[PDB]
Design a protein around this ligand. Sequence first.
Ligand SMILES: [Zn+2]
Length: 256
Amino acid sequence: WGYDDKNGPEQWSKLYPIANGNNQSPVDIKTSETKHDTSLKPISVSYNPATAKEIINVGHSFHVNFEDNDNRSVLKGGPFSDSYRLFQFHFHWGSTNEHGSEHTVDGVKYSAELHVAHWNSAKYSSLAEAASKADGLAVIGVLMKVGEANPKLQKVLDALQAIKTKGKRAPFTNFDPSTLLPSSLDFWTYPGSLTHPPLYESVTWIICKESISVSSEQLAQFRSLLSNVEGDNAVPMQHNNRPTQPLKGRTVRASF
Ligand SMILES: [Zn+2]
């Protein structure tokens, strides 16, 4: 599978039938249809920079992984009763500044999106077990609006030159991803899924109301990563965002 015309999102249903499920992500958040909930508590994140471990080029994107053997880095509050353990963060982008984000707000598309993923360590023993459970994963999504350069993305961007081609990986340590989140943590939440195969409907999404910035040049750095293996003709990672999917009766709740 991929994001190309032949094996792209529109064709994923052939190999992964759940792509046409009733809890698929991303979605378009229509603010006039969101339901306020006083039951929702503020989001609380506490990450230990010592848990940062490695950065990897996976062909269609790049991931920054964290050690998840204990609860040194966790997410709590919001619609959760259990604490979720941080395990990875990555981004999605488009071919030009005009698109790139996965989620949209009132039909508006942004240039990129940051995803910070966690798994339920209170109920499960590992990521593999939790990934298929309805309450197994929690992902924070932050919309990235093109504008001024974001200095907080510096360490991440400077690391790409060491993992330019598919399969390359390198140590990525002493980093706290909470520094990438917006100043305000007001959010929207809804029951969804992984945005790429296997597309499991096991994700409770936390979408931030406030966006963070990114410059046109920083976006160019994401797009310059290569999807081919070392030695082959270079093929830039042009885009990796999935189109929004039908809400199918789900309700998006707002913490504000
Ligand atoms: Zn993602």
